[PDB]
């Protein structure tokens, strides 16, 4: 019997894996591991990974001048 | 479902508001033409004739076939009230509303109408230059400041505050702007007709205590009103009503007579092409339309590049569908204003292409698709983007005495629909915030 | 029959695949 | 652009909007709207007037892109340069514009087709006797091109190498050279007698590219673009059986240059003996007044290192003074080193055959002084439904990254990257099903892999054979 707040983050492989970089760059953004296919984040980092993580997509999709 | 909204406003009314509601005949005439056509028949019986008709003889009017109809029409007109189902010496009778059955009566007949469509004075106007020009514009500006392309005027805070108040057009003061919302697109996707009754039927629902009878006996009787004609004054709450209905460019004033406007009749009943354009592979947008609507509202999900006076160009790109998307704009809405508003060259290859398919194996019919398919695909494929990373608001549990207690507080969750995730081997699961408190409840229990 | 059964062998052996028959988006992604 | 109103919505195009002009009574006919900024040109095929400017646009504006219905193309100073070489003067462009242009044309684009289409055609350059002479038609131009900083019915001699740099300074000055031959005329070199046999059939397009070229009677030297597998091979056999006298064709390729010389066998009548295949294998040349070798860039292009055997056939090309040069696959032509080939050899005519003209460096618009402007270029779409060529089903699959390999993706850098999400596991398994449900469907299947090491994996898990660099011909 312990509850934790936080914010289920559902996503695929190769976001987790995304997830995981900006994690081990800034620390507090995943607080536990669930599984595969789940990850705890938190609440504040959410309105900036969101933002940024699409830069860093940005770099796999041409988008011509 | 023009009809059935303003049916289903109808039947929320209270039976002893709804008598009052037919005292009028003029809405009578108008609550008698929504009605479906074999509604209408049996209504048109029992008007003139004083006598009660057992349900069964309505029955042997229908035949076989049309039991169905008959269903929903008994169904629709019972749940008006205007059909009174008595029962008595063993059969159910049925008879008409009383009130009802008179005020359709004094219309008909040329009886005393206690100038329920009002006076002539005689003092006809000019409606193309001035009617025409200012009800079209009047209601541009409002869709001009739905649209958010700048306009020097602004509507009126009576309408603005009902377009806060009402789902349409979100606004938040910390934003300070507004911004077009999901039933925003389709209420500009409505025809003309729907798209006045949606505003109005916002209208009705936002104003409290002006009667809500009232309120009807306007509105009904604005349509019996033929427009370039002139009228004296009208009730006290519809004084004001009238400057408020002023604003939504239903009727206009010279400053002692008030004229209604062609929306006004277009509220009763309905009544190249402007507004259609080509889709190339290249996403590019060829508008074969010269009038500010479909300008402004390709602009939604469009990053225009050029325009001349008889078409404009444009081209769709990433940042212009994310734009639109970000406002709730859904692709399925985005295709079927694209499929809707189709060149007729578009329809004639894709007719020669569906042809052409059913020609070389005819034994599947294939959908029309007007578009290549390919830029349908991208667009949900750019829908599926925004859509990738899903986040949720809960709490995580976990560090549980007994597996028991575990499967039992995560099935409760589920029973209730707030558990989000679980995992037996670790004895965790995450539920929704909303289902928190309930949970936390249930524990203590 | 033999000519109308080599017609057919022949229209088979030019029909599509079934995937381009449909969009296969709101299907399970490819894979093992 | 005078005494009119903006609209509302005229913020939404940044100086673009083109509502100020008036429209035409006519425009249900009329087919052309013309952007006066950008000279963006958008067609109408399913009006009248559609075909008569099909034509006459892809002239003088480049094709942009060309859908079912609504084509777009583009005004450009090389795509009038191209216009203007073929018997076309500032007059015929503007009449046919306007008479098809649904909005008046502006002054702008008066003014822009003006100044590019009287440069052509006021200075030659001829060659006599493995000599290069500058040669023009009135004797004013000696005070312009003996006194240009660069350059040195008077002609006078200039370097056999220096002619990339004087065309391409003729290029800054106002007249371009335009090479023309007069072949009929021509007696000093040697002929050869060779026609199409019978049993050749010129497609409408070949014709109308022909046409185009020979429209004045004189040869001229561009470039003309064929969809893959269109036939640039047979377009060089025609201009050869029409020139009827000594020819030079490199090749991109030892496999093409076989494949050359037996397609030039079954389409003309050209006899085994007037022609030499240049290749590494044989270097034999032909020993007739006038002949054919067809050779590749490596071969001709080569400057260092030439083999003993390959040395004498070198000066074998070089002596000889070639009457006409036909260049296969011309996009490989402004590279470095290969424009060496066309200031070093001799020829009176010099044309390129490519199915593709566009490349990732800016060099591609070089090809105006190298070669000659782009004489005629074919659509897709229209040859695919006239039967002409196939139709394809093209699709783009989406396999997913292996969580596994997708891990190691993030750490490693760029060079190993591309290796690592290349042979991701799902590619191996989809590769395999395609190639199973094809195979049973009667269909012969092409896979492409530019990385060798992925196709030795996979030509030997699938037991299928596999070509690179390294295997003998
Ligand atoms: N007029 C024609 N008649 C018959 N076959 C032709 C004709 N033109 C081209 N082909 C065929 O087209 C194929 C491709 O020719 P090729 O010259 O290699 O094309 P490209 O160089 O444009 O890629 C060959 O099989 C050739 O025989
Ligand atoms: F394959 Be070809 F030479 F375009």
Known sequence: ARARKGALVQCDPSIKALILQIDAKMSDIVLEELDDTHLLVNPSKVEFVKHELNRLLSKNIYNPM | ?445 | ?32 | ?473
Not at chain 2, 138 to 152: N, R
Not at chain 4, 210 to 222: C, E, I, T, Y
Request: aromatic share 10%; with cysteine; hydrophobic share 40%.
């Open chain 2, 1 to 445: 479902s023009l009809k059935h909204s303003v049916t289903q406003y109808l039947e929320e009314i209270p039976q002893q508001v709804q008598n009052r509601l037919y005292t009028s005949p003029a809405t009578c005439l108008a609550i008698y033409r929504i009605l479906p056509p074999l509604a209408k028949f049996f209504i048109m019986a029992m008007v003139f004739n004083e006598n009660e008709v057992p349900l069964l003889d309505l029955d042997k009017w229908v035949n076989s076939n049309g039991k169905l109809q008959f269903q929903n029409a008994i169904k629709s007109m019972k749940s008006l009230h205007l059909l009174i189902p008595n029962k008595s010496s063993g059969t159910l009778m049925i008879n008409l509303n009383p009130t009802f059955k008179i005020s359709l009566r004094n219309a008909l007949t040329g009886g005393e109408v206690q100038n329920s469509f009002g006076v002539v004075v005689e003092e006809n106007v000019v409606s193309l230059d001035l009617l025409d020009e200012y009800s079209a514009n009047k209601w541009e500006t409002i869709l001009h400041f739905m649209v958010g392309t700048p306009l020097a005027k602004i509507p009126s805070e009576k309408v603005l505050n009902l377009l806060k108040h009402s789902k349409l057009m979100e606004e938040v003061n910390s934003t300070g702007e507004f911004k077009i919302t999901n039933e925003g697109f389709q209420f500009l996707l409505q025809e003309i007709n729907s798209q006045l009754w949606t505003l109005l039927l916002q209208y009705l629902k936002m104003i409290e205590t002006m009667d809500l009878v009232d309120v009807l006996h306007f509105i009904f009787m604005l349509g019996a009103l033929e427009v370039g004609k002139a009228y004296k004054i009208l009730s006290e709450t519809q004084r004001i009503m009238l400057q408020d209905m002023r604003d939504y460019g239903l009727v206009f004033q010279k400053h002692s007579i008030f004229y209604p406007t062609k929306l006004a009749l277009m509220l009763t009943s309905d009544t190249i092409p402007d507004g259609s354009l080509i889709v190339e592979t290249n996403f590019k947008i060829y508008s074969y339309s010269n009038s500010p609507l479909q300008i402004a509202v390709l602009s939604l999900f469009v990053h225009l590049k050029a325009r001349f006076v008889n078409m404009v160009l444009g081209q769709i790109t990433r940042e212009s569908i994310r734009r639109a998307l970000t406002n709730g704009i859904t692709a399925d809405q985005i295709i079927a204003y694209l499929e809707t508003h189709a060149h007729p060259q578009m329809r004639r290859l894709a007719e020669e292409k569906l042809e052409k398919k059913l020609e070389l194996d005819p034994n599947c019919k294939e959908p029309l698709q007007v578009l290549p398919p390919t830029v349908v695909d991208q667009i949900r494929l750019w829908q599926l983007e925004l859509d990738r990373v899903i986040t949720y608001e809960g709490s995580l549990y976990s560090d549980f005495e007994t597996s028991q207690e575990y499967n039992l507080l995560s099935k409760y969750a589920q029973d209730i629909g707030v558990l989000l995730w679980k995992d037996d081997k670790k004895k965790k699961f995450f539920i929704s915030k909303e289902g928190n408190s309930q949970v936390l409840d249930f524990a203590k229990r």
């Open chain 4, 1 to 473: 652009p005078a005494d009119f109103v903006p609209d509302s919505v005229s913020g939404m195009f940044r100086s673009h909007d083109f509502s100020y002009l008036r429209l035409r009574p006519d425009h249900a006919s009329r087919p052309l709207w013309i952007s006066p900024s950008d000279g963006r040109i958008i067609l109408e095929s399913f009006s009248p007037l559609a075909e008569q400017a099909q034509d006459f646009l892809v002239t003088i504006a480049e094709p942009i892109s060309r859908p079912s219905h609504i084509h777009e193309y583009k005004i450009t100073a090389y795509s009038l340069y191209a216009a203007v070489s073929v018997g076309l003067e500032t007059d015929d462009i503007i009449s046919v514009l306007d008479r098809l242009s649904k909005v008046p044309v502006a002054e702008s684009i008066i003014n822009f087709i003006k100044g590019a289409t009287i440069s052509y055609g006021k200075v030659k350059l001829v060659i006599k006797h493995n000599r290069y002479f500058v040669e023009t038609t009135q004797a004013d131009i000696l005070q312009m091109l003996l006194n240009d900083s660069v350059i040195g019915v008077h002609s006078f001699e200039i370097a056999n190498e220096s002619v990339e740099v004087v065309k391409k300074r003729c290029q800054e000055i106002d007249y371009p050279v335009l090479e023309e031959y007069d072949f009929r005329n021509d007696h000093r070199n040697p002929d050869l007698d060779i026609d199409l046999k019978p049993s050749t059939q010129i497609r409408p397009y070949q014709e109308k590219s022909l046409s185009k070229m020979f429209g004045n009677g004189r040869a001229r030297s561009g470039i003309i673009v064929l969809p893959c597998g269109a036939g640039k091979t047979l377009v060089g056999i025609t201009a050869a059986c029409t020139i009827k006298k000594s020819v030079i064709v490199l090749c991109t390729s030892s496999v093409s240059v076989m494949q050359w010389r037996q397609q030039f066998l079954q389409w003309c009548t050209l006899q085994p003996e007037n022609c030499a295949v240049f290749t590494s294998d044989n270097k034999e040349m032909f020993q007739t007044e006038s002949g054919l070798v067809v050779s590749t860039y490596s071969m001709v292009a080569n400057t260092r290192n030439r083999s003993h055997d390959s040395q004498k056939v070198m000066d074998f090309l070089t002596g000889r003074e070639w009457g006409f040069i036909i260049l296969d696959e011309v996009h490989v032509v402004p590279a470095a080193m290969f424009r060496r080939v066309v200031s070093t050899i001799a020829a009176h005519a010099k044309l390129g055959l490519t199915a593709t003209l566009v490349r990732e460096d800016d060099k591609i618009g070089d090809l105006n002084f190298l070669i000659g402007p782009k004489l005629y270029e074919a659509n897709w779409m229209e040859l695919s439904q006239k039967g002409h060529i196939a139709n394809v089903q093209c699709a783009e699959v989406w396999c997913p990254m292996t969580a596994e390999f997708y891990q190691e993706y993030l750490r490693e850098t760029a060079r190993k990257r591309m290796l690592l999400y290349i042979m991701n596991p799902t590619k191996f398994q989809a590769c395999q099903f395609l190639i199973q449900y094809h195979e049973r469907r009667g269909d012969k299947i092409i896979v492409f892999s530019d990385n060798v090491y992925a196709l030795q994996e996979y030509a030997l898990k699938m037991g299928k054979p596999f070509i690179y660099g390294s295997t003998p011909q």
């Open chain 3, 1 to 32: 029959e033999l000519q109308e059964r080599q017609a057919e062998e022949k229209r088979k052996q030019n029909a599509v695949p079934e995937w381009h028959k449909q969009s296969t988006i709101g299907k399970t992604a490819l894979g093992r």
